[PDB]
Design an enzyme around this catalytic site. Structure first.
Site, short mmCIF file in Angstrom:
data_model
loop_
_atom_site.label_atom_id
_atom_site.label_comp_id
_atom_site.label_asym_id
_atom_site.label_seq_id
_atom_site.Cartn_x
_atom_site.Cartn_y
_atom_site.Cartn_z
N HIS A 144 2.63 1.91 -11.59
CA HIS A 144 4.07 2.14 -11.86
C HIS A 144 4.52 2.48 -13.29
O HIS A 144 4.07 1.87 -14.11
CB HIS A 144 4.89 1.00 -11.03
CG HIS A 144 4.40 0.59 -9.73
ND1 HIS A 144 4.95 1.17 -8.51
CD2 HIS A 144 3.24 -0.22 -9.20
CE1 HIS A 144 4.20 0.69 -7.65
NE2 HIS A 144 3.12 -0.06 -7.89
N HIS B 20 4.17 8.95 -4.03
CA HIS B 20 4.85 7.89 -4.79
C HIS B 20 4.07 7.40 -5.94
O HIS B 20 4.88 7.03 -7.03
CB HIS B 20 4.81 6.62 -3.83
CG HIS B 20 5.19 7.04 -2.30
ND1 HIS B 20 6.37 7.52 -1.99
CD2 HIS B 20 4.62 7.17 -1.04
CE1 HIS B 20 6.56 7.75 -0.80
NE2 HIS B 20 5.11 7.55 -0.04
N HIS C 295 -1.68 -2.10 -10.62
CA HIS C 295 -1.97 -3.10 -9.52
C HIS C 295 -3.38 -2.45 -9.10
O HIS C 295 -3.54 -1.54 -8.57
CB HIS C 295 -1.04 -2.52 -8.66
CG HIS C 295 0.25 -3.02 -8.89
ND1 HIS C 295 1.38 -2.78 -8.08
CD2 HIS C 295 0.87 -4.15 -9.78
CE1 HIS C 295 2.46 -3.44 -8.80
NE2 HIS C 295 2.05 -4.27 -9.71
N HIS D 205 -3.55 1.51 -8.68
CA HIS D 205 -2.12 2.57 -8.91
C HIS D 205 -1.60 2.04 -9.93
O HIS D 205 -1.71 0.89 -10.25
CB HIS D 205 -1.79 2.68 -7.72
CG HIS D 205 -1.12 1.59 -7.05
ND1 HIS D 205 -1.67 0.87 -6.14
CD2 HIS D 205 0.15 1.31 -7.42
CE1 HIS D 205 -0.99 -0.06 -5.88
NE2 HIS D 205 0.08 0.01 -6.70
N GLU E 40 7.17 -3.41 -12.81
CA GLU E 40 7.64 -3.72 -11.64
C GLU E 40 8.13 -5.51 -11.85
O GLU E 40 9.29 -5.86 -11.86
CB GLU E 40 6.58 -3.82 -10.46
CG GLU E 40 6.61 -2.45 -10.25
CD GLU E 40 6.40 -2.12 -8.77
OE1 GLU E 40 5.42 -2.84 -8.07
OE2 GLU E 40 7.02 -1.21 -8.06
N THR F 257 5.01 -4.09 -2.79
CA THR F 257 6.26 -3.83 -3.41
C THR F 257 6.66 -2.15 -3.09
O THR F 257 7.75 -1.76 -3.72
CB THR F 257 6.14 -3.82 -4.86
OG1 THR F 257 5.36 -2.43 -5.59
CG2 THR F 257 5.54 -4.96 -5.62
N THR F 258 6.12 -1.49 -2.06
CA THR F 258 6.82 -0.27 -1.53
C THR F 258 6.59 -0.51 0.05
O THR F 258 6.07 -1.57 0.74
CB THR F 258 5.66 0.81 -1.58
OG1 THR F 258 4.42 0.38 -1.26
CG2 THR F 258 5.42 1.17 -3.37
#
Ligand code: ZN
Length: 258
Positions: free
Chosen positions: A93, A61, A116, A91, A103, A195-196
């Site tokens: 995005h 992911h 994040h 991590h 995000e 958010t996942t």
């Protein structure tokens, strides 16, 4: 299982994770004109001088840099937080193109990526207990704006070739996460969610106003990762972001005066 594709992506997460439509979902749009200064907020304290990075891994992911969170080696305190929050991992995005990837949005604008840094409240003893509590986690969100190359990211970029597919990991020691922070810690905060999936509503979000830089080349190296495992079909790891969700009955507060 879940991902970011047309069939299993954010628009369909609610089927297996009905909290996706809950009261306190993330990310959100930050309206800078209506987020109000909050004088009760305390100064935010980032203490990362003794942070101990361990491994970097591709989980299908994103990629995570994991930290030793068995002691208070890297903690977040102050700001909106009660108590001490331990760093466990960071991590990112990012998008398929520089114009998207973050995000959170700011006045509806997207950045090229978003970092994040995930922390958990030590009063619950273990990350796994913390994620079950509304004050369980604090995530520090940092925008990446394309421009000059960022030296503090280069050590990360340099190892991504070793973790191209899901399940790969590599030693990643002596990384200093202070190098990923902007000089100003001015922020916006609101209560929200992972958010996942499983999208748990356990997060105090702390989103910094000042972005850090990333070069177009550096972010293109993120896009050379793959969602798939080796021996499985090719799926470039791009656009691993959830779109913004309704603010509902929440307030975004600013740490600074307009
Ligand atoms: Zn994230």
């Amino acid at each position: 299982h879940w991902g970011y594709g047309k069939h299993n992506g954010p628009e369909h997460w609610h089927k297996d994770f009905p909290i996706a439509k809950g009261e306190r979902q993330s990310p959100v749009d930050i309206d800078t004109h209506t987020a109000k200064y909050d004088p009760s907020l305390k100064p935010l304290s980032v203490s990362y001088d003794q942070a101990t990075s361990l491994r970097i891994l591709n989980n299908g992911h994103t990629f995570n840099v994991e930290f030793d969170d068995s002691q208070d080696k890297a903690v977040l305190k102050g700001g909106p937080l009660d108590g001490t929050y331990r760093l466990i991992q960071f991590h990112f995005h990012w998008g398929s193109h520089d114009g998207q990837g973050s995000e959170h949005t700011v006045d509806k604008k997207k950045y090229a990526a978003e970092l994040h840094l995930v922390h958990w409240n030590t009063k619950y003893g273990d990350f796994g207990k913390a994620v079950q509590q509304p004050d369980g986690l604090a995530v520090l969100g940092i925008f990446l704006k394309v421009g000059s190359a960022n030296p503090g990211l280069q050590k990360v970029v340099d190892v991504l070739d070793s973790i191209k597919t899901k399940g790969k990991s590599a030693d990643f020691t002596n990384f200093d996460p202070r190098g990923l922070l902007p000089f100003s810690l001015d922020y916006w905060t609101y209560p929200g969610s992972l958010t996942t999936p499983p999208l748990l509503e356990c997060v105090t979000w702390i989103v910094l106003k000042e972005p850090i830089s990333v070069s177009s080349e550096q972010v293109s190296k993120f896009r050379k990762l793959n969602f798939n495992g080796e021996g499985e079909p090719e799926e470039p790891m791009v656009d691993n972001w959830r779109p913004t969700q309704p603010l509902k009955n929440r307030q975004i507060k600013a740490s600074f005066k307009h």
